[PDB]
């Protein structure tokens, strides 16, 4: 749930790849 969390969004602005994991 990276796309849902602002941490992964602000941390990975280039591409929401973390979303793949969660």
UniProtKB/Swiss-Prot annotation:
Question: What tissues is it present in?
Answer: Expressed by the venom duct.
What effect is documented for mutating residue 4 to A?
In non-hydroxylated and non-gamma-carboxylated analog; 2.5-fold decrease in potency of inhibition of rat alpha-9-alpha-10/CHRNA9-CHRNA10 nAChR. Decrease in potency of inhibition of HVA calcium channels in rat/mouse DRG neurons
Subcellular location(s): the record lists: Secreted
* Keyword list, A-Z: Acetylcholine receptor inhibiting toxin, Amidation, Cleavage on pair of basic residues, Disulfide bond, G-protein coupled receptor impairing toxin, Gamma-carboxyglutamic acid, Hydroxylation, Ion channel impairing toxin, Neurotoxin, Pharmaceutical, Postsynaptic neurotoxin, Secreted, Signal, Toxin
What do the Gene Ontology cellular component annotations say?
extracellular region; host cell postsynaptic membrane
Q: What is the effect of changing residue 9 to L?
A: In non-hydroxylated and non-gamma-carboxylated analog; 1.7-fold increase in potency of inhibition of rat alpha-9-alpha-10/CHRNA9-CHRNA10 nAChR. 2-fold increase in potency of inhibition of rat alpha-3-beta-2/CHRNA3-CHRNB2 nAChR
**Which Gene Ontology terms cover its molecular function?**
acetylcholine receptor inhibitor activity; ion channel regulator activity; toxin activity
Disulfide-bonded cysteine pairs: these are 2-8, 3-16
The domain of life for this entry's organism is Eukaryota
The entry's comment on post-translational modification says: Hydroxylation of Pro-6 is not important for inhibition of alpha-9-alpha-10/CHRNA9-CHRNA10 nAChRs, since [P6O]Vc1.1 (Pro-6 hydroxylated) shows similar inhibition than native toxin (IC(50)=99.1 nM). In contrast, hydroxylation of Pro-6 seems to impair inhibition of HVA calcium channel currents, since [P6O]Vc1.1 has no effect on HVA calcium channel currents. In vivo, hydroxylation of Pro-6 seems to induce the loss of analgesic effects in rat models of neuropathic pain, since [P6O]Vc1.1 has no effect on mechanical allodynia. Non-native isomers 'ribbon' (with disulfide connectivity C1-C4; C2-C3) and 'beads' (with disulfide connectivity C1-C2; C3-C4) of Vc1.1 also inhibit HVA calcium channel currents in rat DRG neurons (20-30% inhibition at 1 uM toxin). It has been shown that both reduced and alkylated Vc1.1 have no effect on HVA calcium channel currents. The observed activity can be attributed to specific isomers.
Which residue positions does Cysteine amide occur at?
A: 16
Q: What is the effect of changing residue 12 to D/K?
A: In non-hydroxylated and non-gamma-carboxylated analog; about 4.1-fold decrease in potency of inhibition of rat alpha-9-alpha-10/CHRNA9-CHRNA10 nAChR. Decrease in potency of inhibition of HVA calcium channels in rat/mouse DRG neurons
Outcome following mutation: residue 4 to D: In non-hydroxylated and non-gamma-carboxylated analog; 1.7-fold decrease in potency of inhibition of rat alpha-9-alpha-10/CHRNA9-CHRNA10 nAChR. No change in potency of inhibition of HVA calcium channels in rat/mouse DRG neurons
Q: Which residues carry this modification: 4-carboxyglutamate?
A: 14
Predominant localisation class:
secreted
Q: For the region Key region for inhibition of alpha-9-alpha-10/CHRNA9-CHRNA10 nAChR, what residue ranges are annotated?
A: 5-7, 11-15
Q: What is the effect of changing residue 1 to A/D?
A: In non-hydroxylated and non-gamma-carboxylated analog; no change in potency of inhibition of rat alpha-9-alpha-10/CHRNA9-CHRNA10 nAChR. No change in potency of inhibition of HVA calcium channels in rat/mouse DRG neurons
Q: What else is known?
A: The synthetic peptide Vc1.1 (a non-hydroxylated and non-gamma-carboxylated analog of Vc1a) shows weak inhibition on nAChRs composed of alpha-3-alpha-5-beta-2/CHRNA3-CHRNA5-CHRNB2 (IC(50)=7.2 uM), alpha-3-beta-2/CHRNA3-CHRNB2 (IC(50)=5.5-7.3 uM), alpha-3-beta-4/CHRNA3-CHRNB4 (IC(50)=4.2 uM), alpha-3-alpha-5-beta-4/CHRNA3-CHRNA5-CHRNB4 (IC(50)>30 uM), alpha-4-beta-2/CHRNA4-CHRNB2 (IC(50)>30 uM), alpha-4-beta-4/CHRNA4-CHRNB4 (IC(50)>30 uM), rat alpha-7/CHRNA7 (IC(50)=7.1 uM) and alpha-1-beta-1-gamma-delta/CHRNA1-CHRNB1-CHRNG-CHRND (IC(50)>30 uM) subunits. cVc1.1 is a cyclic peptide with inhibitory activity on alpha-9-alpha-10/CHRNA9-CHRNA10 nAChRs (IC(50)=766 nM) and a high potency at inhibiting HVA calcium channels in mice DRG neurons (IC(50)=0.3 nM). Toxin cVc1.1[D11A; E14A] is a cyclic peptide with a very low inhibitory activity on alpha-9-alpha-10/CHRNA9-CHRNA10 nAChRs (IC(50)>17 uM) and a high potency at inhibiting HVA calcium channels in mice DRG neurons (IC(50)=3.3 nM). Both of them show antinociceptive actions, with greater efficacy in a model of animal chronic visceral hypersensitivity (CVH).
Q: What does this protein do?
A: Alpha-conotoxins act on postsynaptic membranes, they bind to the nicotinic acetylcholine receptors (nAChR) and thus inhibit them. This toxin (native toxin Vc1a; hydroxylated and gamma-carboxylated) blocks alpha-9-alpha-10/CHRNA9-CHRNA10 nAChRs (IC(50)=62.9 nM). In contrast to the non-post-translationally modified analog Vc1.1, Vc1a does not inhibit high voltage-activated (HVA) calcium channel currents. In vivo, in contrast to Vc1.1, Vc1a does not show analgesic effects in rat models of neuropathic pain. The synthetic peptide Vc1.1 (a non-hydroxylated and non-gamma-carboxylated analog of Vc1a) has two types of targets. It blocks alpha-9-alpha-10/CHRNA9-CHRNA10 nAChRs (on rat receptors, IC(50)=19-109 nM) (with preference for rat over human receptors) and inhibits high voltage-activated (HVA) calcium channel (Cav2.2, Cav2.3) currents by acting on GABA(B) receptors (GABBR1 and GABBR2) (IC(50)=1.7 nM). It also shows moderate inhibition on alpha-6/alpha-3-beta-2-beta-3 (CHRNA6/CHRNA3-CHRNB2-CHRNB3) (IC(50)=140 nM) and alpha-6/alpha-3-beta-4 (CHRNA6/CHRNA3-CHRNB4) (IC(50)=980 nM).
Could you tell me what this protein is called?
Alpha-conotoxin Vc1a
Whole-protein coverage range: 50 to 66 of 66
